[PDB]
RNA sequence: AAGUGUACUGAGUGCACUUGGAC
RNA sequence: GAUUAACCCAAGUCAAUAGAAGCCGGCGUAAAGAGUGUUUUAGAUCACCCCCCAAUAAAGCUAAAACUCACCUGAGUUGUAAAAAACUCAGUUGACACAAAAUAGACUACGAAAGUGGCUUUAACAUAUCUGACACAAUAGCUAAGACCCAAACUGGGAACCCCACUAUGCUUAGCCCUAAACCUCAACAGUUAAUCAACAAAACUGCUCGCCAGAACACUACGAGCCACAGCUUAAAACUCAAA
């Protein structure tokens, strides 16, 4: 644009950054509701464990449970951080292994 | 109750011998949802149309029905329906007269339900015919106020269940609504570019227009022929040109329809008033009812 | 009662503008008060009502319609409108509707409660 | 043939427009 | 998933979040030149050297061809792939429009744009010697009244597409609606041809100003608002999703 146009329009108005799945916080607490499996998008196919958890803000979200083996059950307390899974569309949270009811990865 | 597995689209292509013009709902879950919305079918007499592959048939049989009268047109699906009947010892049949089909309550519903997922090219004539049947208290409704659950295109269902002033108000809306309680309960889901709505019709105990079906149809069609003009523009055509002005004025005045009202701003009460006045006019003028303005203009 | 025995006699000899306070929600007694004539409902003080959700004006019009149905032909009520005399909201549209149609001919009787805003 | 706008009907048609097609 | 080996950092490591990275770039085809024209405050230096064709409105008029009506004849006419359906009507001659405007036109003009191609007359086609929001805006559509040859959404009949008849509508008046692939898809003005340049398109650029765009879809959408006078147009988002488009 012209110099006058730039002056009139002022500096760019950078849009506010959208709040991530964790609403801007690096972690949250939640209560597990229902565990289940999910099929990753092809070519990846290995079943992946997910759990519906009600965050500290009331919102319910599906969170991927990493690793092998767990004991998560209904009404159990977990801590969930951000980070989308590579091949689980929609799932945009991860249970932090080693906190609260999430007994360490049951190796 | 164990039933045969639903045919996949592979078996359907093999069955129709195409080796590669119809859409099949092969989703038993959606069929179960439709059967649920149809109501409680426990020990009910269900008349099923447009059977097709048979997902609706399987869902209804899963529902504890007493007799389920299937009517199919294509003979390539009869083998599957026969297998279904053998699995669930379903009366299959290949214009059909349902009145003689079943063994009749006075005008609650007489435990007789109708379920249909037909081609949209065939549902509209069928629903018009059944509306006339309700008007005459005959056909499938000899048993009483039989309830119907039919799948239409999304637009057609919206027009059927449209309210006064709703952009989808139209002839179908008025015709269905002055005889039936119509409820649009929509599917996006079919194995083979439109959405599908499910609509439930319950005949009204007291119809909102006590006039002949053909008379009401003529009145509504002439009213709605000009959907963007004042109602009188479309009403005036019911009369010969010679007496058009005076007859239209007399009609509107003997009714209480404001001439500025557009066609979609007319309620069933307005249509009742118009139909009554038009019936009086036809009674006192025999030639009026058969008049066709385009036929006159042909000269 | 005073209105029944003094003014209803004159009214029952035309159009009636029945003003109803939107905040406060006489309706069932209209058939005796005015008689069988054309009536238009005007919900006043709409501006003072907060906008709880979109389409609240439509919801209010609907609610007035069921209230009238509970009490009347839809005496016949031919129009339900929402106005705010203080802010002049909808007054011009009401005037246009009044002048646009044959049905609104004759005199106009403005009936309502004390606080309805009839003066305004 | 394709598409824009617009209106009726249930994807077509009517009017005008463009080649982001062929001769 | 386990095992071996290796790499980086190391009393740390690195998973999440947040921040630091932020406008002199573009607008024919990717988002982008807003349908068109004119102001003010201003801005810029480009200010100093400097007929007529087809615009528009009104009034009047008509050559060819239609329809209808007259006779005169004929019994079929129309319709197409071929038939149906339909009319008893058809041919010549004559009279005869409120419709449309061959040929010129292989011209490229007028108008801001949309548009403007029958004839005559009247009125008439702004301006500085720069750019820059109220007035217009094709076809379609609506209101009231007229015209209705022909064409024709829709309807009906015949065997969606084909044939037949006919209506909105196309036309006049008086008002509305304001959208088009409103496109030369290339903004106005001034200037240049000096060294070519994503590709294609209408060779490439410079200066100057205004408008417009900041991934896709959600979304010519919702909410609100304006115009409406209620079924629509203009303005126009958000959330959720994706690493594409
Ligand atoms: Mg200027
Ligand atoms: Mg402008
Ligand atoms: Mg226009
Ligand atoms: Mg016409």
From Swiss-Prot, chain A:
Report TM segments: none
Which Gene Ontology cellular component terms are annotated?
A: mitochondrial inner membrane; mitochondrial ribosome; mitochondrial small ribosomal subunit; mitochondrion; ribosome
Major localization class? mitochondrion
A single GO BP term for this record reads: translation
Q: Any idea where this protein resides?
A: Mitochondrion
Coiled coil segments of this chain: none
Keyword Cytoplasm assigned to the entry: answer is no
| Similarity comment: family membership | Belongs to the universal ribosomal protein uS12 family.
Describe, as the record does, how this protein assembles with itself and its partners. Answer: Component of the mitochondrial small ribosomal subunit (mt-SSU). Mature mammalian 55S mitochondrial ribosomes consist of a small (28S) and a large (39S) subunit. The 28S small subunit contains a 12S ribosomal RNA (12S mt-rRNA) and 30 different proteins. The 39S large subunit contains a 16S rRNA (16S mt-rRNA), a copy of mitochondrial valine transfer RNA (mt-tRNA(Val)), which plays an integral structural role, and 52 different proteins.
Name of the protein in its database record: Small ribosomal subunit protein uS12m
Organism of derivation: Homo sapiens
Q: Which gene encodes it?
A: MRPS12
Q: Which residues of the complete protein appear here?
A: 31 to 137 of 138
Curated annotation (Swiss-Prot), chain B:
The record lists the effect of residue 228 to E as:
Abolishes the interaction between 12S helix 45 and TFB1M
Q: Where is the transit peptide?
A: 1-18
Q: Where in the cell is it found?
A: Mitochondrion
Keywords on this record? Answer: DNA-binding, Methyltransferase, Mitochondrion, RNA-binding, rRNA processing, S-adenosyl-L-methionine, Transcription, Transcription regulation, Transferase, Transit peptide
What does the induction field say?
Answer: By the nuclear respiratory factors NRF1 and NRF2/GABPB2 and PGC-1 coactivators.
Q: Which reaction does it catalyse?
A: adenosine(N)/adenosine(N+1) in rRNA + 4 S-adenosyl-L-methionine = N(6)-dimethyladenosine(N)/N(6)-dimethyladenosine(N+1) in rRNA + 4 S-adenosyl-L-homocysteine + 4 H(+)
**Tissues where the protein occurs:** Ubiquitously expressed.
Main function: Mitochondrial methyltransferase which uses S-adenosyl methionine to dimethylate two highly conserved adjacent adenosine residues (A1583 and A1584) within the loop of helix 45 at the 3-prime end of 12S rRNA, thereby regulating the assembly or stability of the small subunit of the mitochondrial ribosome. Also required for basal transcription of mitochondrial DNA, probably via its interaction with POLRMT and TFAM. Stimulates transcription independently of the methyltransferase activity.
| Other remarks on this protein | It has been proposed that variations in TFB1M may influence the clinical expression of aminoglycoside-induced deafness caused by the A1555G mutation in the mitochondrial 12S rRNA. However, this was later questioned as patients with the A1555G mutation had similar 12S rRNA methylation levels to controls.
Q: What is this protein called?
A: Dimethyladenosine transferase 1, mitochondrial
Curated annotation (Swiss-Prot), chain C:
Localization annotation: Mitochondrion inner membrane
What protein family does this chain belong to? Belongs to the TRAFAC class YlqF/YawG GTPase family. NOA1 subfamily.
* Function description: Involved in regulation of mitochondrial protein translation and respiration. Plays a role in mitochondria-mediated cell death. May act as a scaffolding protein or stabilizer of respiratory chain supercomplexes. Binds GTP.
Q: How does it assemble?
A: Homodimer or multimer. Interacts with mitochondrial complex I, DAP3, MRPL12 and MRPS27.
What name appears for this protein in its UniProt entry?
Answer: Nitric oxide-associated protein 1
Which species is this UniProt entry from? Homo sapiens
């Amino acid at each position: 644009a012209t110099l006058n146009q730039m002056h009139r329009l002022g500096p760019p108005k950078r849009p506010p950054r959208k709040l991530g799945p964790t609403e801007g916080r690096p972690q949250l607490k939640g209560v597990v509701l229902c565990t289940f499996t999910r099929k990753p998008k092809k070519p990846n196919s290995a079943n992946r464990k997910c759990c519906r958890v009600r965050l500290s803000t009331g919102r319910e979200a599906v969170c991927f449970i990493p690793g092998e083996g767990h004991t998560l059950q209904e009404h159990q307390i977990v801590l969930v951080e951000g980070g989308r899974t590579q091949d689980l569309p929609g799932v945009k949270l991860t249970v932090v292994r080693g906190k609260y009811d999430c007994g360490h990865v049951q190796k | 109750c164990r039933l045969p597995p639903l045919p996949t689209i592979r078996e359907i292509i093999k069955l129709l011998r195409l080796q590669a013009s119809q859409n099949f709902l092969l989703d038993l879950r959606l069929t179960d949802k439709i059967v649920r919305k149809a109501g409680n079918l426990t020990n009910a007499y269900v008349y099923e149309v447009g059977p097709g592959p048979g997902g609706i048939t399987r869902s209804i049989l899963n529902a504890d029905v007493a007799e389920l009268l299937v009517v199919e047109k294509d003979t390539r699906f009869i083998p599957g329906l026969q297998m279904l009947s053998d699995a669930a010892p379903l009366r299959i049949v290949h214009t059909f007269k349902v009145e003689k089909a079943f063994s009749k309550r006075p005008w609650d519903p007489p435990n007789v339900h109708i379920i249909g997922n037909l081609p949209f090219s065939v549902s509209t004539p069928l629903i018009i015919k059944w509306l006339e049947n309700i008007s005459c208290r005959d056909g499938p409704f000899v048993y009483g106020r039989t309830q119907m659950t039919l799948t239409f295109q999304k637009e057609v269902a919206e027009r059927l269940a449209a309210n006064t002033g709703s952009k989808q108000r139209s002839r179908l809306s008025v015709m269905a609504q002055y005889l039936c309680n119509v409820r649009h309960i929509t599917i996006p889901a079919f194995v083979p570019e439109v959405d599908v709505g499910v609509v439930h019709f319950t005949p009204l105990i007291q119809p909102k227009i006590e006039q002949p079906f053909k008379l009401v149809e003529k009145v509504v069609q002439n009213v709605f022929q000009f959907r963007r003009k004042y109602c009188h523009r479309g009403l005036r055509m019911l009369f010969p040109e010679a007496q058009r002005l005076e007859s239209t004025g007399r009609l509107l005045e003997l009714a209480d329809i404001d001439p500025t009202l557009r066609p979609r701003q007319l309620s069933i009460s307005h249509f009742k008033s118009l139909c009554d006045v038009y019936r009086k006019m036809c009674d006192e003028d025999p030639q009026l009812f058969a008049y066709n303005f385009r036929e006159e203009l042909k000269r | 009662e005073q209105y029944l025995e003094l003014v209803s006699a004159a009214l029952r000899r035309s159009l009636v503008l029945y003003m109803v306070d939107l905040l406060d929600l006489l309706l069932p007694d209209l058939p005796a008060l005015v008689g069988p004539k054309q009536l238009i409902v005007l919900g006043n003080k709409v501006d003072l009502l907060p906008q709880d959700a979109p389409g609240y004006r439509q919801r209010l019009r609907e609610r007035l319609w069921e209230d009238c149905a509970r009490a009347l032909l839809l005496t016949v009520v031919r129009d339900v409108r929402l106005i705010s005399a203080k802010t002049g909201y909808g007054v011009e549209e009401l005037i246009s509707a009044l002048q646009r149609s044959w049905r609104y001919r004759g005199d106009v009787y403005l009936v309502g409660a004390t606080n309805a805003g009839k003066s305004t």
